[PDB]
Symmetry: C3
Subunit: 164 residues, 3 copies
């Protein structure tokens, strides 16, 4: 079941890629993009109490507007992970559906201090397809939050070193 | 609180998601959209403790365990997010682990690619990918057998001071 | 965060990456007035329990000692044969050179059977951007039935200057 393979599949051409898109967490719609999975400490009217988990199938679009070209999906879960200032842990992938990156994914395991940090860095822990052996990071930042409902648009920039 | 020989291995084995009958290797952790047809509805979470055999038969040589959770992750179709380790119990890689964070997409891709996100023991500094095809699937009842191919880079050995510990005493390699 | 990030455009290898050893104590507080965790789902920690944690990291084994970070995330009971944990967590540091920075961990944690448990660093942030390495956790102080614990951590990461 183990089988040592030779390293000599070696020399590969390196690429750099910058992605820029908009992440849509649609809470209150008639077609919302997430669902609460668990809420110990109950339901707050605008915050997320420590311990609650949300599954998420959030669209990634070229611009702030929902009509703009779909370009990927952010799927996974986020969890309220601070008993002090509200913070989240993102455990998700970003799956690309467009052009040269269709089918490829990037993996994220990151803390997300949405209450206090204006530009938030997230670590790329892995990639697939075009992003095999991906090495990079992301910077996230609120484009808008609607605190009536709780919908949010997050602007992402991705910096990823990888191969062709 | 602060201070300041790479190998490459192919692995082949079989992943046993066992839902039906006695001996279920998993359990459902939450389902906010109840039960569904032949699907886990969006938001369902399932804890696994799945055997890893050298061949597709349950009776086959057990060689590791796939431990973690998966979540049904699409509203448009059935897809999974795997958050898991593969912990091996045999051979050179006994006691070693690989970690996976990956989208599955079990209804749309024959071969599903998954990034190796890190490793332990013999797999320290692991980087690589997995490919997963079904050997056998039953979206009616749920269980399935999944073939895996893993190609992983990694390094061997150890580093090179000890603090007293009332439990474990001294030493640490040191 | 910071207004610029520099790095080497390699994919693999260390190029301009350095090596750091961290040592601290992880506080799993289950009982008493103010616990550091919450049970999230429960389909002593039976298979499938999910716990969310917000655990203080201190430079010594005392709660008293200087706070240097938080370990935050979820753990899950992942084993049917004995109590075993999957950790999905970040370590966020708040002191000294690595104030602001984080490390990500995705790891099995065989708390009943392994006196030293190795956990993969799968990512970092800020001063730990592109982090690679491992943590070693061993108990300093454990009560298996109440659940409280102090875990000694040694962390070895390669990361850039």
């Amino acid at each position: 079941y183990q089988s040592m393979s030779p390293t000599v599949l070696g020399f590969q051409e390196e690429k750099f890629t910058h992605l820029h898109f908009y992440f849509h967490d649609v809470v209150t719609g008639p077609k919302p993009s997430m669902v609460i999975v668990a809420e110990p400490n109950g339901k707050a009217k605008n915050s997320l109490p420590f311990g609650t988990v949300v599954a998420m199938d959030d669209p990634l679009t070229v611009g702030p507007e929902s009509d703009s070209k779909l370009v990927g999906k952010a799927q996974g879960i986020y969890t309220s992970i601070s008993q002090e200032e509200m913070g989240l842990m993102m455990v998700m992938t970003m799956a690309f559906s467009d052009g040269e990156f269709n089918g490829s994914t990037l993996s994220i395991l990151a803390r997300n201090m949405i209450m206090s940090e204006p530009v938030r860095e997230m670590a790329i822990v892995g990639g697939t397809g075009a992003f095999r052996f991906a090495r990079g990071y992301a910077q996230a930042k609120f484009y808008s939050v609607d605190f009536t409902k709780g919908d949010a648009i997050v602007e992402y920039d991705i910096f990823v070193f990888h191969y062709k």
